[PDB]
Amino acid sequence: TRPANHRQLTFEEIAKSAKITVNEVELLVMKALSVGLVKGSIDEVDKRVHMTWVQPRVLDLQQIKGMKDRLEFWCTDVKSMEMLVEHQAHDILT
Amino acid sequence: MPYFLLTQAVRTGNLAKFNQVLDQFGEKFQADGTYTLIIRLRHNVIKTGVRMISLSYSRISLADIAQKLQLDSPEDAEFIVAKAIRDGVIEASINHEKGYVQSKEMIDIYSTREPQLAFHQRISFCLDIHNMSVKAMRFP
Amino acid sequence: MSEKKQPVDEDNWDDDNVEDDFSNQLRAELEKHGYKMETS
């Protein structure tokens, strides 16, 4: 849902949403590692659960609108500065 | 020879040795007309003396460096270190009670920062000489 | 040059650059560092 990253997550956030105790967060997130929805290893010093990859599920009308916001934003940002690569460096090529 | 031992007294922070050089060797300096610096070079040597100590030590106390550089008083030492920070000479923090000066090692200059940024001026210096060699080659 | 203004107006020498640092600082030194034995 979020664009992240904001990849590594704090245990208190999992203890908020999933409302699970601190001692049980291990079994929780590590079981998802075997299921395959997330491969992210867990950082157990600060007890923060790090995420890798992602599992997409279905879609919603607000997801397409949320897509065009953060998807085309990659299109308008890169092509804008890509013209800067085309502009200045077209003289040294010719 | 009169101008030789001068710089030998610049490497040291002694006032009695520096003033004796000005008295005996000041006659040779009259023909050069270099007397403009001798008043501001006293402030230059005290920066070399404190840089020698600050680079050799992590922490340097104002009371220990007082008589070692013979500033003789705590109050003018607070004035020198203040102007040393104003000139960007020293990074030392100072804890004022009596007081004393407690500094720490300055780092993070590292590798990825200074050398590659300086190499921008090095290569721009070298690539211009490539043109200097071509221009000199075009005459023959 | 010889033009313009300037005409009007191993060795031990190489080690003397470092050797003069011994003259104004810490002598050589044997006697003093030899006296520090029985000091403390």
Added chain:
Amino acid sequence: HGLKGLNSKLLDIRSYLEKVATGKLPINHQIIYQLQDVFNLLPDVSLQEFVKAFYLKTNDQMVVV
């Protein structure tokens, strides 16, 4: 790579917005958003989320320069 990469980006994102409007199905489903979310390993959105890749950014340019 920016031209041909981001033009199909705009052509599809306009047809994907057209989905809600008309032409539904294709729902698709699900292949559209699935690999789009594989593209989402890095978005990269504001700003670049490179705090871990920042020092590593110039560190790859370290020896090249």
Added chain:
Amino acid sequence: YLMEGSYNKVFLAKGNIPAESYTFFIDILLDTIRDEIAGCIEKAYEKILFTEATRILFFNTPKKMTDYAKKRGWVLGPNNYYSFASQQQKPEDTTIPSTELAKQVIEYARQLEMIV
């Protein structure tokens, strides 16, 4: 003496001067020295006691140091002055220059293409 700095030694030499007519200029020499007590002494020191700053400013309890408590800000502490917080502003300095480092490679790689 301004490089000592003075402050003290200047005012002692201000006791006897021929001068002559310097009386008007030594009053402006005050103001240009007086505003340096705030500028020179910090940054950066931790805490300097009340009467220690008064020793340089002379007088007894002038409104100049009261104007300093306003202007500096900085801190007005009881029987002491503080540099909080802290020492000051805690420069990181910035994580942004990683951007301009990529900008430096732009023209640098262009200079490699100019030779070519």
